[PDB]
Design a protein around this ligand. Structure first.
Ligand code: NA
Length: 357
């Protein structure tokens, strides 16, 4: 069973990084496990670890034959030796605190089926490469993050004329949080969206339409999904299909903090209660400005990879939100507004690259 008569080498797809003023940066592979499968059976496996980044793997021992597949998992915390293909493809990941320090940002890739010949085989190497069997020439293997990213590129406040005498908001004093974030996902599949109904929040807020509180849904605090506001600050998150169930479950990025009076002091009575009962803030004066990420609605403008919201989170996309606040927020960011929130959004959607080096 252990005898081999071939090696496989491959190149990983990489690109020019032009990510600059954002915390959530492009991918760098520091740990990679490459496997060769013949149907369900793992016929080769090699793990490499390089702090400087991995862009190719050479000389993986394996067995010649038809219809082999290269399966890759990177930046991971799994034990993969000997697993069947079914086992590997059933692996999940979950959002954890270390993900927000860019640790265990799982990446995967999988080739189409190809023939391995005896001797030295090369997958995704350049055209004309010296080989006993060159496959996928000029198309390196795509090994990509399972996580997406959501961040604020910027938040500005320009209170509309009707609110200028009544309210102010200071983003420098604010926090940001993810709401209605899927807890888990698959790591292989046409879509990574899991059928669990488990979600996370960075800050507890009142139940509304978007809150996962229907039968079988769970909704738990994850403190790593809140941070202070700063330009480019945000969160790694997982795939989600917003309309998978009977009620919408949009992943939300929100900024929240004190709704102040026109002079930047706390609201006092009666202005405080006027604002609370209008739905703007809670008893402490806290107001929320939610953005439904990649939602088709609410006047949101999109550029980059898309110009229309898709009502989902897709792996390896960085959703960079520029928010303009023009009025008081809401005390219930997990409800839709009856008319329209006092905010405008432009969102640049940029896929991450694997940094070339
Ligand atoms: Na509900």
């Amino acid at each position: 069973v252990v005898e081999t008569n071939a090696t496989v080498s491959f190149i990983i797809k990489s690109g020019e990084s032009r990510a600059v003023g954002d915390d959530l940066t492009d991918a760098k592979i520091t740990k990679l496990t490459a496997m060769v499968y013949a149907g369900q059976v793992q016929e080769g496996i090699k793990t490499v670890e390089e702090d400087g980044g991995v862009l190719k793997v050479e000389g993986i021992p394996c067995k010649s034959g038809a219809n082999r597949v290269l399966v890759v998992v990177a930046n991971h915390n799994y034990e993969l030796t000997g697993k069947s293909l079914n086992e590997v493809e059933a692996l999940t990941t979950s959002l954890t605190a270390e993900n927000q320090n860019a640790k265990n940002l799982i990446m995967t890739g999988k080739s189409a089926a190809f023939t391995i010949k005896p001797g030295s085989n090369h997958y995704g190497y350049p055209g004309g490469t010296a080989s006993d069997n060159l496959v996928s020439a000029g198309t390196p293997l795509a090994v990509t993050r399972v996580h997406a990213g959501i961040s604020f590129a910027g938040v500005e406040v320009n209170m509309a004329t009707q609110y200028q005498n009544y309210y102010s908001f200071k983003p420098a004093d604010a926090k940001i949080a993810a709401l209605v974030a899927k807890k888990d996902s698959k790591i292989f599949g046409n879509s990574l969206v899991s059928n669990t109904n488990a979600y996370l929040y960075g800050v507890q807020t009142p139940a509304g339409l978007y809150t996962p509180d229907a039968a079988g849904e769970t909704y738990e605090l994850e403190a790593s999904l809140n941070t202070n506001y700063a330009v480019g600050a945000g969160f790694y998150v997982l795939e989600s299909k917003y309309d998978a169930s009977n009620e919408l479950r949009p992943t939300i990025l929100c900024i929240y903090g004190k709704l102040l009076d026109k002079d930047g002091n706390p609201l006092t009575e009666p202005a405080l209660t006027d604002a609370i009962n209008a739905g703007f803030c809670d008893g402490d004066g806290t107001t929320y400005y939610p953005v439904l990420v990649n939602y088709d609605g609410n006047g949101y403008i999109y550029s980059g990879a898309i110009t229309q919201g898709q009502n989902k989170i897709v792996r390896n996309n960085h959703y960079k939100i520029s928010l303009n606040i023009t009025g008081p927020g809401t005390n219930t960011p997990e409800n839709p507004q009856p008319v329209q929130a006092n905010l405008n959004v432009t969102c640049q959607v940029t896929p991450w690259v694997v940094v070339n080096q």
